[PDB]
Design a protein around this ligand. Sequence first.
Ligand code: ZN
Ligand code: ZN
Lengths: 142, 575, 510
Amino acid sequence: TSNVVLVSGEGERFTVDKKIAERSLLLKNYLNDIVMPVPNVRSSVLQKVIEWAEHHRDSNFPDEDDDDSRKSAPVDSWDREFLKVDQEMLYEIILAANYLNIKPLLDAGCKVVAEMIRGRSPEEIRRTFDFTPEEEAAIRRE
Amino acid sequence: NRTTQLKSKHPCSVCTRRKVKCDRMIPCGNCRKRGQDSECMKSTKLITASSSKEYLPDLLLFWQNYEYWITNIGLYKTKQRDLTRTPANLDTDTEECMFWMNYLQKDQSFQLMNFAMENLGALYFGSIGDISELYLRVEQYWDRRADKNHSVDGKYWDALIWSVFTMCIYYMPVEKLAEIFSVYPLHEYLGSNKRLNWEDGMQLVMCQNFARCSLFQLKQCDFMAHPDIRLVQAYLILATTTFPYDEPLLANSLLTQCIHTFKNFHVDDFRPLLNDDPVESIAKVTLGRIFYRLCGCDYLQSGPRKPIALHTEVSSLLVYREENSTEVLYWKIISLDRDLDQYLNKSSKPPLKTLDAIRRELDIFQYKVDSLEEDFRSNNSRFQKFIALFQISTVSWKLFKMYLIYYDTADSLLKVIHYSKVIISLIVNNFHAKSEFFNRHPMVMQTITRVVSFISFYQIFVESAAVKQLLVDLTELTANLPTIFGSKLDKLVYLTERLSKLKLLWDKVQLLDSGDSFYHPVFKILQNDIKIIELKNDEMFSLIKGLGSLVPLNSDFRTIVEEFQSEYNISDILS
Amino acid sequence: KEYLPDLLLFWQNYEYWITNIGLYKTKQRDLTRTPANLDTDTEECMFWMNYLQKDQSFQLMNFAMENLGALYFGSIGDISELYLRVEQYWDRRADKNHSVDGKYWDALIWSVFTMCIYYMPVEKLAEIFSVYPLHEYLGSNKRLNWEDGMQLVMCQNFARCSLFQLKQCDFMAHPDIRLVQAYLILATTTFPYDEPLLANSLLTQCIHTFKNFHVDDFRPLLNDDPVESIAKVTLGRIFYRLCGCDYLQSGPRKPIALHREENSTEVLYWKIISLDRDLDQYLNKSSKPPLKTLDAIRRELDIFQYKVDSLEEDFRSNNSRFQKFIALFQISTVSWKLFKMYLIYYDTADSLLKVIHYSKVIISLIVNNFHAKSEFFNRHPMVMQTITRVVSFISFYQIFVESAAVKQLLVDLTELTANLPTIFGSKLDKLVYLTERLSKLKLLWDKVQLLDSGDSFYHPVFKILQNDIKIIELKNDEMFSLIKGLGSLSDFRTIVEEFQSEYNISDILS
Ligand SMILES: [Zn+2]
Ligand SMILES: [Zn+2]
């Protein structure tokens, strides 16, 4: 198996196996016509993506289009430990994957963020107010 | 071109206190006109980042209309006429086709058929099927020369084989063509320059003369007096060359004749029912193939010079009753193309669920086109692979262009650059030996015209180095497309060249302001070109000229506009 | 006697297939034996244009201007202006190079010349032309005079010359409105019955060239150049006339549908033909139009009856009498079809009396034209269609219900049929044959006892009438042409086969 070449946004040349790089559908459509560039992606982010793809190279995720019907199904512990980073790195993971068209990582990351959303304290949600300043006081009345 | 940015939820309290409409684009297009800026802004959210490009979204929405009335209609599908100077067809092309049927000889035609059987199969197989049986018909033509009485059916077979001869002459590489034919009596007859070789332009001349002699035989058939399937077959053979772009209203008239000839049969369903002749079932399957190829070559001649839509009940939103053999999946691509490009001359926005379904069908078709194996020596299967992958590339490009314009999703522009590089790669990979003529299909002219026009238009306003290198790539590619696009290719050059000059007019003159909308000569020239071509396609003047003796008789900003229109006129894209 | 209503419902279907489709709109062909015209009528149209002279053409135009107004006003209005074009014709005769627009004008005036040759009565027609070079060229019998058939021959050759000039124009490459003008000149004669599918092809060219202009509304505006208003009113004329000539050619060989002083008469004609469409949209469908629809059609028919009775005429203005004739004949024909559908679907009291009444009205309208200076009034194809419908339903109702008034009426129809003018030619003969066939179809209903199954009935006349429909529906499929185009691919029965062996149906087809 000849290996393929990805280029990050920072100019780094990554080299990886074909059968794990074909997890990203952009690379699949690109090589079914080897260097492919991936801009807007920090090099650590692309390395995290290639690590996550090499971990699940023989996994099985449901399905193709029964997705939001079969989801929700809870996420495995290795991926949640993998995505236990600060939030700017997380949004960079999600945007880079949405460029790379990897849907199961996208669903896993969105489940993490939605877990952060669905679950906030009541004291958080009492902030940031509506383009009516005067009517806000009538809302702030009670 | 209305200014905009940062859509600002509520209507502002200034515009509500005075009871006018509130353009919410921050702060207003109205408060900025008066000079009341501190009132509308300084309530909440004092976050400013003056990007100085607030003229961009309505400009990008204007690109929709400019693509629709320049790149589509006004370059390919437009032809002005002069009824008082076009000469009458007094010879009726009798001398012309007399000579250009005394030219072609027998073994030459057999070598043409050999090349056709070898290398062109994915064109005519959807129409007629086997070609070698058709050799017999060729035999019959060469059996029936010196006779003085001919059947209607025989001249129909002759018209079909001359259309296939025209497809051969169009798609042949110049070395084999120089092996087979000779040159010298063509310059003895026509009267062009006596050193014009086959790369010089005689290929296009001989191709158009063969298509004209095919139509001459169809005229000897009295083809409007006998509806038969061979008119439809000869048209679908001729509808892969540039004959849909030489005489476009003649093509529209012949296509209407073919629509009538198909609808004569009153066939609605194509699946063979349980209680029929096997001959009837074979006939209805062949009819299904010809109907889908007809719907394709009917959609690719839309516009205002052809009103009769065939297009009966065909969609792919949330056709299915068919076998995905080759022609149904060739149709589904163009159905998705129609479902995207119905929004050019509209004024509404397609929702999210539509484009998401289009993205999912795009993935399915990518999967089940790349999921086919073949033989490497099978040249025809490679060429079918080229056509299917080029079409799916073009549809992906238009999809993310519409994403970019209507909603500007995450990193849309670089995706457009990505698929543009893919299209460039698919032509440059075919620049090598033995696969040269693969760049002679009309869909590459369509896709290259769309790409170079959007990249020049986006070059004029917003600059990045990747976009500039991409434009250099496109210019390098357009410099070496094959010469059989001929004069059409030259006019595409002119259009891009005009846009290059329109960059300089963005530079040497400052953008003005009026508080609400902007003003610049480039906007007026841009919206002067669409007005000139929409004048050129209102047929009321020919109507008044035809009904009888009713003869119709009707700052330095303006100086700059009229100087640029005096030097670089739009009306040189016509002929 | 319960067999009557289902037999009446069978009459609708038999009328739709045999009378309309079969006798007029069906032409079989042999693509293997039909000679492809390598000459392309060059010798033929060359001779029929070297024959015609100049002052003869002016006399043709004089008869056209005086006595033909209510046909060409719907398309081209004034014709004296067109005199100038005629001059240009003889001014551009012996030239060596030509144009496109001049050839379109020549095609229009040749179509008008075809109409002039067609509606000319035999006296002046003999006064103009000779007969001798016609038999020097064609070589038929010298005694063949103009009433013998040379009128129809010269009419069809001038129609052929007009289509020859339209094919010199390359008319599929220069779509102008004069194609529509030449076609709506030619579509008033019986040229849509010589070559029906060629006429369908030309009509589809006309629909294409019309929708090439993109004009929906024809109402003029204050803020327009009045040249545009003149053009939009002219286009409104040509649109409604072309929709009428659409409805005259429905069926299975044309599947591309379209839907002050004298303009009110044009609106009158269109509303007549639209009510005709509203009636005859029930032939081949199995639907029964209800009573409310028939009552509304009757009330509107009374209103248009009053409006046509509110018209006027003048005995020297022969065009006014011809216009009155056409309008009254149309209103009578639609009235007859209304009460025929009354009789068949519902059988109201004195439905039959109204059928007999309007039948006598139609007979009087045709017979009263037999005076001098009123012959050519009969040469319009709507009376041919109407006579066919009337005499077929009279014979069909004669066979199964017998009455002395109806029998005298059928004798009147049969007496009237043999005195229609010669210009329908062989087509006329075929209608006679149909009537004669129905006469023999009476006799078989006489000498045979009707059987009974307890539920349904049996008689050979039923099987003969059903076999004719199935034979012509077999002749109305192009599947055999498709296969030839793709590649190289009790004594009941005895009586039925004896009658079908003697009186075949294939004589009514071309
Ligand atoms: Zn406001
Ligand atoms: Zn404001």
